[PDB]
A = this chain, B = another copy of it.
Amino acid sequence: IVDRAKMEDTLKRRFFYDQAFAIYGGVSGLYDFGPVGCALKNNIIQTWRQHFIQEEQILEIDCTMLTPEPVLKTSGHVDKFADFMVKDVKNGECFRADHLLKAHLQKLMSDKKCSVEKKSEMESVLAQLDNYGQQELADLFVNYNVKSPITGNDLSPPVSFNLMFKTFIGPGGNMPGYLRPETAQGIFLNFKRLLEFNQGKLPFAAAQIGNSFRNEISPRSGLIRVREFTMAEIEHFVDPSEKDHPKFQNVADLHLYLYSAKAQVSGQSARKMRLGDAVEQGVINNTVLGYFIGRIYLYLTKVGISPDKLRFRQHMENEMAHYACDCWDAESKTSYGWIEIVGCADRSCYDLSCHARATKVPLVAEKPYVEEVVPNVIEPSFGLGRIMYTVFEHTFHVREGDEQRTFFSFPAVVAPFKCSVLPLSQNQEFMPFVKELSEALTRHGVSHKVDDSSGSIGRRYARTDEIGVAFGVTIDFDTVNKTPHTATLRDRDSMRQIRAEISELPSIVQDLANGNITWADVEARYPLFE
């Protein structure tokens, strides 16, 4: 339970992000990222690069965003990539059918005038919604009588609205195209010279961190639903017969909530298994999937998402992507209910096949006489957008002081900047102290900023906390005067302080942020301070 109202308000005021083209009414599904937003957004794509590209020697490429017609036709995107949209036959108002029906039903199950017998039934209708194809969705839009949310008119019948943006490359209109709804296609259309890098042998994973455009219908989900976003995608090309990851054992003992395809059809709660077991019982196909699912958990977790508000639901036979046979999503429980933030497909040969065929250009590899194969691709797609957002809600708190102060408990690895050095006076009695501390902190690789903002120390740290700055060091007169020179070390969340030799503080703040020491350990080592 979080305060979407109060939070959005804080986030936009400190300018983590806000509405794009504000002074024009703004466009739905489009937002701009302000300074702290950028800082935090770049800390996540950075933490990610380590956790994946670095930790897996993943090849990286940077493809185009403008894709020409054929490429997306071959991938079958021009076809199956779209959402069901309806529109009241009055004014041209559109709505994503998929969701409107869900909104209606919740309204019905919520009205006390409902028989527990129908309520239980409707749930069952929502717990399958993504499987509902053109027809079933058509009928349902009749039985339940779905009508325009506003001025309840009569919605047209569910239709298919392709989510890809449309444009024409170059003068004229001979070469039409779209804005890549995913980065993957580029990583595929480059398979040949990519295999080469890994010596033609599998497995090997390529990757991309760039934008994708998805002309959504009704962006009303805040940052969650946007028509333009940055996504990190890994394309793990493995040999079909070797769908077995060598590192699995590292993420084997993780105990994470899983919501199998069965548990969804056998209408039962998601279990909190162990990856190792989850694979034994054949819940999670192979180990390649398992490893990634494990890492994906370690990442989302490390960035800031709460272990208890995260899970992995599997897709349904027809909820499936138009390019996968099996797939698990990383869902984060938020004010918008559970929401997919990271996807883990298992698109089997379907990609390189389509392209190899359509162009008559062979896309394969070899193995030890030396047989040829079409690498199956397990693809972990990250919605850096929705991820940073989950981190927002999962770590947004309210200082328990009438005043109504709000702080973010961002892990030291994603905080706008780890420490905030703040002295009382600006005079020269302090500079020689602030200077050193800064340079010393710099030497220790600790992102920091010297505070200036007017106000009592406690009012200062108010803003520092506002944007989740991990720590803070107070430099007062006693720091300058008394000898030895000690400053105040203040933990963000607790607001508890520690007096300590301003010389050691750096190496300490470092150990704290790097997870090498606990706040408690500090209170045990150093004298407190009020």
Neighbour of A193 across the interface among B15, B24, B30, B228, CB < 8 A: B15
Whole-angstrom CA separation of A87 from B172 in the bound complex: 11
**A160-168, A258-266, A279-287 - the one binding chain B:** A160-168
Task: Give residues 294-312 of A contacting B (CB, 8 Å).
Answer: none
Q: A197 vs B87: C-alpha distance in the bound complex, in angstroms?
A: 43
Residue A41 contacts which of B30, B62, B172, B355 (CB distance < 8 angstroms)? B62
0/1 string, A154-184, CB within 8 A of B gives 1: 0000000100011111111011010100000
Interface residues of A in 188-224 (CB under 8 A from B): 189-190, 192-193, 197, 211, 213, 215-217
Taking the closest CB of chain B, its distance from the CB of A316, in whole angstroms, is 26
Cα distance A167–B216 in the bound complex, in angstroms? 14
Interface residues of A in 7-54 (CB under 8 A from B): 15, 18, 20-24, 27-35, 37-38, 41
Closest to A191 in B: B23
Interface bin, chain A: 35 or more
* Residue from B23, B41, B65, B70 within 8 A of A211 (CB atoms): B65
Q: Give the chain B neighbours of A87 by CB distance below 8 A.
A: 171
Cα distance A18–B194 when bound, in Å?
A: 12
A20 with B63: in contact, given A32-B190, A68-B27, A172-B94 (CB under 8 Å)?
A: yes
Q: Which residue of B lies closest to A171 (CB)?
A: B94
CA distance A24 to B355 in the complex (A): 9
User: Which of B23, B35, B216 has a CB less than 8 Å from the CB of A197?
Assistant: B35
Q: Kindly state whether residue A110 has any CB partner on chain B within 8 Å.
A: no
Chain B neighbourhood of A192, CB < 8 A:
23
Q: Pick the contact of A32 from B20, B31, B64, B197 — CB < 8 Å?
A: B64
- How many whole Å from A222's CB to the nearest CB in chain B? 15
Minimal Cβ-Cβ distance residue in B for A226: B64
Are the C-beta atoms of B64 and A20 separated by less than 8 Å?
yes
A227 in contact (CB, < 8 A): yes
Complex contacts, A232 vs chain B, CB 8 Å: none
Are the CB atoms of B27 and A175 closer together than 8 Å? yes
Q: Which residue of B lies closest to A193 (CB)?
A: B15
**Chain B positions within 8 Å of A361 at CB level:** 23
User: Are B59 and A35 in touch, CB under 8 angstroms?
Assistant: yes
Task: Answer whether A30 and B228 are a contact pair too, CB < 8 Å, given A171-B161, A172-B92, A215-B170.
Answer: no
With A23-B361, A59-B35, A211-B211 as known contacts, state yes or no: A28 contacts B170, CB within 8 Å: yes
- Closest-CB distance, A123 to chain B (whole angstroms): 29
Q: Are B92 and A227 in contact (CB under 8 A)?
A: no
A78 beta carbon closer than 8 Å to chain B: no
A92 CB → nearest B CB, Å: 6
Which of B161, B216, B355 has a CB less than 8 Å from the CB of A23?
B355
CA–CA, A530 and B511, complex, Å: 46
**If A38-B62, A167-B166, A171-B217 touch, does A70 touch B15 (CB 8 Å cutoff)?**
no
Chain B residues within an 8 Å CB radius of A216:
170
Measured in the bound complex, the distance between the Cα atoms of B25 and A359 in whole Å is 10
Interface check A512, CB cutoff 8 A: no
- Bound-state CA distance A190–B30 (Å) is 14
A47 to B47, CA, bound (A): 20
Cα A171 to Cα B211 with chains together (Å): 20
Q: Which residues of B contact A383 (CB under 8 A)?
A: none
Taken together as a complex, chains A and B put the C-alpha atoms of A18 and B190 apart, in Å, by 10
B359 and A24 contact, CB distance less than 8 A: yes
Which single residue of chain B is at the shortest CB-CB distance from A87? Answer: B171
Contact string against B for A residues 228-249, beta-carbon threshold 8 Å, 1 for contact and 0 otherwise:
1000000000000000000000
Residue of B nearest to A60 (CB): B38
Closest-CB distance, A452 to chain B (whole angstroms): 10
22 A–B pairs (Cβ distance < 8 Å), ordered by A: A20-B186, A21-B67, A21-B68, A22-B190, A23-B189, A24-B68, A24-B359, A33-B61, A34-B61, A35-B60, A38-B60, A41-B62, A66-B227, A85-B171, A87-B171, A94-B171, A94-B172, A166-B167, A166-B168, A169-B215, A169-B227, A211-B211
List the 3 closest pairs (A to B, CB-CB), nearest first. A33-B62, A32-B63, A94-B171
